[PDB]
Design a protein around this ligand. Structure first.
Ligand SMILES: Nc1ncnc2c1ncn2[C@@H]1O[C@H](COP(=O)(O)O)[C@@H](O)[C@H]1O
Length: 273
């Protein structure tokens, strides 16, 4: 009955996603995050299997909820006069990948391999559920520091997965593909693989490879840190200029650099605790 089933924590950060808040679901003292999203600022809409009009964010999240801890799970959603209030699980303690890199700098390849692997598994889950994230980047990845588990968040720029061309994009540009920049046209998976190459470079070098349109289009990768040849191969393959020259997810996960990954919990005991 009502939204009174949630005590309200402090703010965690504002942006284009909305206003997210720490929370403590009082039904069972469970830790949740409450995201408020104004009706006015939502452009993309959709509908639930039952035929109700909601923000696409809700539609996407519902499709990706299962026992798999790799995506932020949606627990509930409410509809306020001018806003959709969302209830989401909140790991604790937690820190997003952006802040983790800001503090720690470039990651050791072993760490980057565990992290990248977990993101690959999470993206695969979304796709298998018919969802395309469209904003894969370090700010949208949460790290459960106790369990060494990564979690994909903010599907507010996402879309249903399809095999035809996408000609709309409202995700992060420096992560967007050269086909989006030159033609305003892309396909789901290839574009997703491009952002993952950006994200892998980010983890192993401490920052993203391109900042300007021309650099994206030119696709020339310069390594500013020592990075193994195998890792540079994978990155450069993900950042192939022609979409068809990019690796599939299977090809990424079968790459030599991705072999012998650490399990989440091993990852934490060695690199987080
Ligand atoms: N602790 C958290 N901090 C920020 N966002 C969170 C947190 N836990 C879950 N989320 C969800 O992740 C998204 C935040 O968007 P962004 O900061 O752009 O990655 C929203 O959809 C939130 O509801």
């Amino acid at each position: 009955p009502l939204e009174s089933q949630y005590q309200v924590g402090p703010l965690l950060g504002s942006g284009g996603f909305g206003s997210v808040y720490s929370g403590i679901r009082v039904s069972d003292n469970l830790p949740v995050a409450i995201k408020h999203v104004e009706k006015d600022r939502i452009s993309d809409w959709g509908e639930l299997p039952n035929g109700t009009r909601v923000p696409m964010e809700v539609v996407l999240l519902k499709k990706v909820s299962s026992g798999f801890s790799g995506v932020i799970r949606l627990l509930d959603w409410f509809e306020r006069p001018d806003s959709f209030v969302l209830i989401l699980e909140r790991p604790e303690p937690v820190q997003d990948l952006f802040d983790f890199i800001t503090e720690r700098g470039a990651l050791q390849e072993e760490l980057a391999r565990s992290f990248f692997w977990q993101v690959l598994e999470a993206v695969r889950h979304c796709h298998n559920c018919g969802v395309l994230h469209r904003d894969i980047k370090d700010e949208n990845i949460l790290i459960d520091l106790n369990r060494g588990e990564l979690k994909l968040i903010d599907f507010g720029s996402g879309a249903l997965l399809k095999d035809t061309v996408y000609t709309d994009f409202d995700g992060t540009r420096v992560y967007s593909p050269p086909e989006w920049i030159r033609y305003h046209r892309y396909h789901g998976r290839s574009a997703a693989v491009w952002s993952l190459g950006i994200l892998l470079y980010d983890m192993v070098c401490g920052d993203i490879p391109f900042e300007h349109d021309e650099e994206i289009i030119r696709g020339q990768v310069f390594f500013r840190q020592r990075v193994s040849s195998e890792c540079q191969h994978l990155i450069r393959w993900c950042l192939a200029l022609r979409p068809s020259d990019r690796p599939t997810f299977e090809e990424i996960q079968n790459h030599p650099w991705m072999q012998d990954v650490l399990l989440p919990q091993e990852t934490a005991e060695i690199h987080l605790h």
